Scaffold this active site. Sequence first.
Site, short mmCIF file in Angstrom:
data_model
loop_
_atom_site.label_atom_id
_atom_site.label_comp_id
_atom_site.label_asym_id
_atom_site.label_seq_id
_atom_site.Cartn_x
_atom_site.Cartn_y
_atom_site.Cartn_z
N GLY A 209 0.79 -1.22 0.00
CA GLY A 209 0.00 0.00 0.00
C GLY A 209 0.82 1.27 0.00
O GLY A 209 0.38 2.30 0.51
N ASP B 296 8.57 5.16 1.64
CA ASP B 296 8.16 6.04 0.55
C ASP B 296 8.21 7.52 0.94
O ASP B 296 7.99 8.39 0.10
CB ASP B 296 6.75 5.68 0.06
CG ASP B 296 5.74 5.59 1.18
OD1 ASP B 296 6.06 6.02 2.30
OD2 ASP B 296 4.62 5.09 0.93
N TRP C 156 -2.41 -1.99 10.40
CA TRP C 156 -1.62 -1.62 9.24
C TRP C 156 -0.33 -0.99 9.73
O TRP C 156 -0.29 0.21 9.99
CB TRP C 156 -2.42 -0.65 8.35
CG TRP C 156 -1.71 -0.06 7.14
CD1 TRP C 156 -0.41 0.37 7.07
CD2 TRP C 156 -2.27 0.17 5.84
NE1 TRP C 156 -0.14 0.85 5.82
CE2 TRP C 156 -1.26 0.74 5.04
CE3 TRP C 156 -3.53 -0.05 5.28
CZ2 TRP C 156 -1.47 1.09 3.71
CZ3 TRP C 156 -3.73 0.30 3.95
CH2 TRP C 156 -2.71 0.86 3.18
N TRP C 157 0.73 -1.79 9.87
CA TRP C 157 1.98 -1.29 10.42
C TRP C 157 2.90 -0.74 9.34
O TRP C 157 3.34 -1.47 8.45
CB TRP C 157 2.70 -2.40 11.19
CG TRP C 157 3.83 -1.89 12.03
CD1 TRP C 157 3.79 -0.80 12.86
CD2 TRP C 157 5.15 -2.43 12.14
NE1 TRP C 157 5.01 -0.63 13.47
CE2 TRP C 157 5.86 -1.62 13.05
CE3 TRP C 157 5.80 -3.53 11.56
CZ2 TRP C 157 7.19 -1.87 13.39
CZ3 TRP C 157 7.12 -3.77 11.90
CH2 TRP C 157 7.80 -2.95 12.80
N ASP D 191 -6.01 9.12 3.05
CA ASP D 191 -5.37 10.19 2.28
C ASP D 191 -6.27 10.85 1.24
O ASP D 191 -5.85 11.05 0.10
CB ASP D 191 -4.12 9.65 1.58
CG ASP D 191 -3.06 9.17 2.56
OD1 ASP D 191 -3.11 9.58 3.74
OD2 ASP D 191 -2.17 8.40 2.14
N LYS E 120 -0.58 2.54 -4.19
CA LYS E 120 -1.17 3.86 -4.38
C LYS E 120 -1.09 4.37 -5.81
O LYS E 120 -1.98 5.08 -6.28
CB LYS E 120 -0.50 4.87 -3.44
CG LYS E 120 -0.93 4.74 -1.99
CD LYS E 120 -2.38 5.17 -1.79
CE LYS E 120 -2.74 5.30 -0.31
NZ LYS E 120 -2.82 4.00 0.41
N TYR F 110 -7.00 6.98 10.21
CA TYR F 110 -6.36 5.68 10.42
C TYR F 110 -5.29 5.70 11.52
O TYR F 110 -4.56 4.73 11.70
CB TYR F 110 -5.73 5.19 9.11
CG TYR F 110 -4.85 6.20 8.40
CD1 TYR F 110 -5.40 7.10 7.50
CD2 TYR F 110 -3.48 6.24 8.62
CE1 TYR F 110 -4.62 8.02 6.84
CE2 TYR F 110 -2.69 7.16 7.97
CZ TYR F 110 -3.26 8.05 7.08
OH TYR F 110 -2.48 8.97 6.42
#
Length: 685
Positions: free
Chosen positions: A132, A341, A334-335, A240, A163, A279
Amino acid sequence: SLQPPPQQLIVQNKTIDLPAVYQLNGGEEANPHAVKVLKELLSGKQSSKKGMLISIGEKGDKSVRKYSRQIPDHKEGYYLSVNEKEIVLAGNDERGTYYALQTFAQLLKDGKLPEVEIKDYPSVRYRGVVEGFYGTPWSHQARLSQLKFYGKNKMNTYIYGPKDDPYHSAPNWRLPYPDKEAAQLQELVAVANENEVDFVWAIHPGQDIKWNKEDRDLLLAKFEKMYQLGVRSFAVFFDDISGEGTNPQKQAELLNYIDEKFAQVKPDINQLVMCPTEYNKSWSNPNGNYLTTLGDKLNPSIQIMWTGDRVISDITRDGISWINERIKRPAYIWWNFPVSDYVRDHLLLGPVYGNDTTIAKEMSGFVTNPMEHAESSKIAIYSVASYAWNPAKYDTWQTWKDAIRTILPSAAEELECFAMHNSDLGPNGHGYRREESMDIQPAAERFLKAFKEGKNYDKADFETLQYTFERMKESADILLMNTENKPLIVEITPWVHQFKLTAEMGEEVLKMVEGRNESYFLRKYNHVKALQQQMFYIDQTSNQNPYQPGVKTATRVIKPLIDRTFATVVKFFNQKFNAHLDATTDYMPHKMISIKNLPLQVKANRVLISPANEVVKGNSVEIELDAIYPGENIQINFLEISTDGKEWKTVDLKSRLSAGLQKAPVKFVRFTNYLRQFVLTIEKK
Ligand SMILES: CC(=O)N[C@H]1/C(=N/OC(=O)Nc2ccccc2)O[C@H](CO)[C@@H](O)[C@@H]1O
Ligand SMILES: CCOc1ncnc2ccccc12
C-alpha cells in the site's frame, strides 16, 4: 531456528533418518498443496506398503483419526509428531496441514529429522503484507516471489493496493484492468492459493467518488471483475483523501452494501476490509465523531484498519485499546514499517520491534506495509510473520538474523553487516526513527570526544573502527557479485556502492588521525575529497525519484563520525602547519557566500539552500553555479541574476514567491532587501 516458533514444542534428543521406504497415509484426501510439498521432500525415496508410515490429513480424516485429540482446535492449527515408528502431519484445517509441512521442512536437515512433538497455532488470525505504498509498484516476478515467501512463513494475507496503480486509485478505479494486467492478476491469485495466501484486492475510490447509484454500481462491477479473475477477498481504502469521500456514514453504508449484496451473496468470499479516513489517533479529530460512527454503523464482520497512535507508530496496549473501544471491534493493524516512501533515499533493513507482544487477542489482523524494494523487505516481512504467529516467543534480533540467513545463505554475515548500518530513516516529518550501528556506537562515541579534546582515544576503539570499515568493504564487494538472489542485489546495489565509499572514506580519515608525516596527510586528504565527489556522483545519478532522490547510508552513527573526525583533524592540521585546507565534508560543485553556514544541496535539476529552524532577520546572499545553465524558475518562500556577476538583471516576484526565468542564462543569483525554501531550478541534462 523454527520460524515462526511453534506455540508448544517438546524436543527429545534423537535423530531419525528420512526413510527410504514409506507408506503414505491420507495423501488423496489431504490438502493437495500440502501433499505436493510432502512429495517434493521425498524424491529419491520409494513408496510401498512396507515401511515407515506417514500420516497426512485434516481433522475428521480417517488418516489422522487417532490424533484428533492431539490436534489444536484453532483455525490454521496443526499437530506434528516425529518418532522412530511413524510421522504425523495433521492440521485442524487444510491451511493447518499446509503449515504443518512448512514446519516439517525446516526440521529436515542432512536428510535427518529430530524426534519432536509440536502443537501449534497462530495467535493472530490474519497475518501478512499490504502493498500500500507510494512509488513504483512491485513487479510481477517480485510478487510471485513474495507469495512463495508468505506461504513458507505462514502469512495468510496479501492485500494488493499500490497507491500509484491507476486501476486501484483515482480515477480509473472504475475501469477494469487491461487483458495483460488481468492475466497477471489471475496468475497471482492462482499462486497465492497454492501458498495458502488470501489475495485481497483493495480499491481506493474516495477522492473522486460521489455517493450515488452510478459510482456504487461501478465499484461493485469492478469487484465482480476481480472475482472472475479469482479474487475472493476485497478491501476499500479511504485513506489520504479530502471531500465528500471522508463521510463516515456514507463509507459505512457503502461497505455494508458491498457486504450484503456481494460478499454474502457469493458462496466463497473470505475477508472484507476497509481503511478509514482517520487511520491513526493523532489525525483523529475529537471535536466531531468519525470513528464511533464507523464502529456503530459498519457491520461487525467487516475489518477496520489502523496504523497506531500516529501514521508511523509502534502498536501498544493502551493505543490499541483506544481505537478498539471506538470501532467496537478488534483493530486490523496496518503497520507502516519498513515502508520508506517518505524517506526514499534510505533502505530500512533493520530489525522489527516496538510492538507489544501480549496484545494478540486485541487485534483482528496485522499486516506490514513494505518498501517498493520487494526482496529487501523480506527481512521485515520474515520478522512480522514471526511476531504475528507467536508474539509471546518473539525474539527481535534472533529473527532478524534468521531472516537474513534465509534470504541469502551464501553471504549471511555480509548482508548482516550491510543491514546493521542501514536501518535508520534519518530526519523526517513523522519523527519516526530506528536504532542503527549500536555495536560500534559506544566506541565511536568515546573516540570522537577524546579526539575533539586534548585527551587520547583508546586504542581498542580505534581498531574497532578499522575493523568495521574493513568489514564493510568486504560485505559490499561480496554482495555486488552474489548470484543467489539477483533481484535483491539489483535493489540495494546503489546503496552498496555508497556503502563501500563510506567505508573507504572512513579508512582514509583514520589514517589522517595518525598523521605521521606531512606529505602522507595530504595524500589521504586529496583521496577523501575525491571520495566525497564520488559519493556526490552516486547521490545524483542513482534513485532519482521526485521526492527524496539519491542514496544515503550509515547515516546515524558512521557518516557523522567520519565527517566530524575529518573536520577536526583538518582543523588540527591547519593549526599546526598554518594551512587553509577545506574542512567541508559534503562535496558541492557550486558556491554560496554572504544563512552563512547553511550548506547547499543539489536535488535533480534544483540547487537549493539547506533550510533552518531559526528565525531570520540591505544584506544579500549570493549563489554561484559551477557553469552557465538555462534558468527555469526561482521558488523562494518566506531578486537578481547574472552570468558573470557584473551585469545583473532584476527579476520580479509575486505565500509562494514565484519567478519565471524563461530559460534565461544563469550562473550567479542574488537576493537583496523565515526561510522555508530557497530553490533555483535550472534546465535538465
Ligand atoms: C494508511 C496509510 O498508511 N496511508 C499511507 C501513509 N501515509 O500517510 C500520509 O502521511 N499521507 C498524507 C498525509 C498528508 C497529506 C497527504 C497524504 O503511510 C504509508 C507510508 O507513508 C503510505 O505508504 C500509505 O500509503
Ligand atoms: C497524495 C500523495 O502523497 C504522496 N506522494 C508521494 N509519496 C508519498 C509518501 C508518503 C506519503 C505520501 C505520499
